[PDB]
Design an enzyme around this catalytic site. Structure first.
Site, short mmCIF file in Angstrom:
data_model
loop_
_atom_site.label_atom_id
_atom_site.label_comp_id
_atom_site.label_asym_id
_atom_site.label_seq_id
_atom_site.Cartn_x
_atom_site.Cartn_y
_atom_site.Cartn_z
N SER A 33 -1.12 15.81 -11.62
CA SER A 33 -1.34 15.34 -12.96
C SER A 33 -1.65 16.49 -13.83
O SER A 33 -1.92 17.62 -13.59
CB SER A 33 -2.38 14.38 -13.12
N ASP A 63 0.81 -1.11 0.01
CA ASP A 63 0.19 0.14 0.01
C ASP A 63 0.90 1.26 -0.10
O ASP A 63 1.50 1.69 0.88
CB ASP A 63 -0.85 0.07 1.28
#
Ligand SMILES: O=C(CN1CCCCC1)Nc1ccc2c(c1)OCO2
EC number: 3.4.23.22
Length: 330
Positions: A199, A35
């Site tokens: 992004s 994770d």
């Protein structure tokens, strides 16, 4: 040194991925959920509440000659999805794909939430976010990567998740055969403890690319792709019949649909998520309503580049003194 381990989807929907991990002497092999969204290595154990264990492989520290109780230490974690677990701590020898860490903090579960009990395929988590999020008290502990880093040939790990198929977690090296083109690196903020980046935009299907900054985290421990409501709305608007359902808890769509792709930007580069990666199957057994793999992050507090996105890329977690993230097509 280096390590290389295969990661396998837990079910036909890629709801999560498990990687075998060797703990203790003699080794006890447990299948853990790697994770990059958290920083605790915790396991089902001989200490876990009997009624909360159903199918999992457990760690028994008393059977390990290298296990040592970390005196007074406890841990308690609550994930973003409401799940949780807590217990006490040992240090022990932990190996991943041939790569070994001695004295790794292994957090032994005394308690787990229902959702963990209910998934017999996951024996615990191995966190790969920054150790600043580790929950051990009163002495915070380091993550496996953190412990191994100085020893690795290069202070990096890579996530190569497959779509309906196994993939690979590598430590200390980049496999130049596992991706196409080049790797585009992008800046990371470690301020909240996450692999947090920005992004440069998106496209829907064969749509025009929209230049727009989207701050989010690279999270292998989250299944779906969680983005701003505007973005998510523009995506599902291309699917006939798709709807946001409060009763199911997200965007659903007709299972007879052909989903369009979703592109996200990484600097000047582009990663394309094929439409099939966004189909998470009937909302309930036999239903002709299917659950969407792209969902709104509104209400989460952060955008999450979950497995749906990461599995469309070869992803480099560069833990150099100034960490960065790298994305390549494959
Ligand atoms: O809770 C989760 C994922 N979750 C992690 C533990 C195993 C079951 C899946 N989502 C999540 C993951 C990272 C986050 C977040 C939410 O909010 C901020 O960072």
């Amino acid at each position: 040194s280096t390590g290389s381990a295969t990661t396998t989807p837990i079910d036909s929907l890629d709801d999560a991925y498990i990687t075998p991990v060797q703990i203790g002497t003699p080794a006890q092999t447990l299948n853990l959920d790697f994770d990059t969204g958290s920083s605790d290595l915790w396991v089902f154990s001989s200490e876990t509440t009997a009624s909360e264990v159903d199918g999992q492989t457990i760690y028994t520290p008393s059977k390990s000659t290298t296990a040592k109780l970390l005196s007074g230490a406890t841990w308690s974690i609550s994930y973003g999805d409401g799940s949780s677990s807590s217990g006490d701590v040992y240090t022990d020898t932990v190996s991943v794909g041939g790569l070994t860490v001695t004295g790794q903090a292994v957090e032994s579960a005394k308690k787990v939430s229902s959702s963990f009990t209910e998934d017999s395929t996951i024996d615990g988590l191995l966190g790969l976010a920054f150790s600043t999020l580790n929950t051990v008290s009163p002495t915070q502990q380091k993550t496996f990567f953190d412990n191994a880093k100085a020893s690795l040939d290069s202070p990096v790990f890579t996530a190569d998740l497959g779509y309906h198929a196994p993939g690979t977690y590598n430590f200390g090296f980049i496999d130049t055969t596992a991706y196409t083109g080049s790797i585009t690196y992008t800046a990371v903020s470690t301020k909240q403890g996450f692999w947090e980046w920005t992004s440069t935009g998106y496209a829907v299907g064969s749509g025009t690319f929209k230049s727009t900054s989207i701050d989010g985290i690279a999270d292998t421990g989250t299944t779906l792709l969680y983005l701003p409501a505007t973005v998510v709305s523009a995506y599902w608007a291309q699917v006939s019949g798709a709807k946001s359902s409060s009763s199911v808890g997200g965007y659903v769509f007709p299972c007879s649909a052909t989903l369009p792709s979703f592109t996200f930007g990484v600097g000047s580069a582009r990663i394309v998520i094929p439409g099939d990666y966004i189909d998470f199957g009937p909302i309930s057994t036999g239903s002709s309503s299917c659950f969407g793999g792209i969902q709104s992050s509104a209400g989460i507090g952060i955008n999450i580049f979950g497995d749906v996105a990461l599995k469309a890329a070869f992803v480099v977690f560069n833990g150099a003194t100034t960490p960065t993230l790298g994305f390549a097509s494959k």
